Symmetry: C2
Subunit: 185 residues, 2 copies
């Protein structure tokens, strides 16, 4: 039963507990990570083999330590600070001022507009990711091939990866908006 | 002495980081102004509060007083996390498959020159943007380099450094590298 709560794990980055489903434990034990019982015990912040047995089951970065609930919370907080704290306005003022030739202003505007359109298409694809995460197994809308590659990035990052990429590209998009606004003045 | 080690803190994301007086002073000053309680948590100390306030007061840090998951991090682990994020952006993000997929949504032979000019513009605008983040000289760990940027933009990037404990600009550069790898794969694939 993939949505059974295997256990509840206190967050590593708090100043209470995330549920870890059997589906999440299975993602960790499967490729591409195939965590051993030593690494899985660290993730669960723990015999473990016996509890795996009953429900029926067998390159480390700092992201490998995360339960999916905390990985998603971390990405959400990164997105929040990218939106509310990144100084998109000052970055636009500074970079526009490095391109002051009145004869390059049309080219710069066109490059900024191209960049916004290309970045929006890229983050739209990442929003279409339907990788299983937490107790969720949404039905895919992307072709299986691309979805498979996005799922690979989900599994090595414990869900942090694609949302964190979108968070950063929102700081970039806010720069581009502020740049266009300032140029028009 | 800003580079005096205040204490050493075990990592929260391992399966110890030195904290300088300079780092503690960043936590106690605007924009965060952490109190004894939140600072105690950052330093992962087990009255603890009375002991911490004494230790601070003795090295000349004043402590009478929005918290994110980043607020929990010592600067050495924040920088390690951004480095690991950038590593998986470079080595694990499927930039090639993303390029193949997105190029196929624009297969009209008369739009190919426009799409290529849009991808080249994006690479150049993103490079200017990450070159600026590389020019950030925000104090971090035991480092206090001479700034090379204007003071105004450096104070704004420093604000982003302080709220993110050093994670923020490196992590933005990590993500934009994934984007840059997509753009390069999309150009390569179009020319084939």
């Amino acid at each position: 039963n993939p949505n059974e709560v295997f256990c509840s794990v206190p967050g590593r980055l708090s100043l209470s507990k995330y549920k870890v489903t059997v589906a999440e434990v299975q993602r960790r034990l499967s490729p591409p990570e195939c965590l051993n019982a030593s690494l899985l015990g660290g993730v669960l912040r723990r015999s473990l083999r016996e509890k795996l047995d009953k429900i029926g089951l067998n390159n480390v970065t700092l992201l490998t330590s995360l339960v999916e609930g905390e990985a998603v919370h971390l990405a959400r907080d990164f997105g929040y600070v990218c939106e509310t704290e990144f100084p998109a306005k000052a970055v636009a003022e500074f970079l526009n001022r490095q391109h002051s030739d009145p004869n390059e202003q049309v080219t710069r505007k066109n490059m900024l507009l191209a960049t916004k359109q290309i970045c929006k298409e890229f983050t739209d694809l990442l929003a279409q990711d339907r990788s299983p995460l937490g107790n969720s197994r949404p039905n895919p809308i992307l072709e299986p091939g691309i979805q498979s590659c996005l799922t690979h990035f989900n599994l090595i990052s414990h869900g942090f990866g694609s949302p964190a990429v979108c968070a950063a590209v929102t700081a970039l998009q806010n720069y581009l908006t502020e740049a266009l606004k300032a140029m028009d003045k």
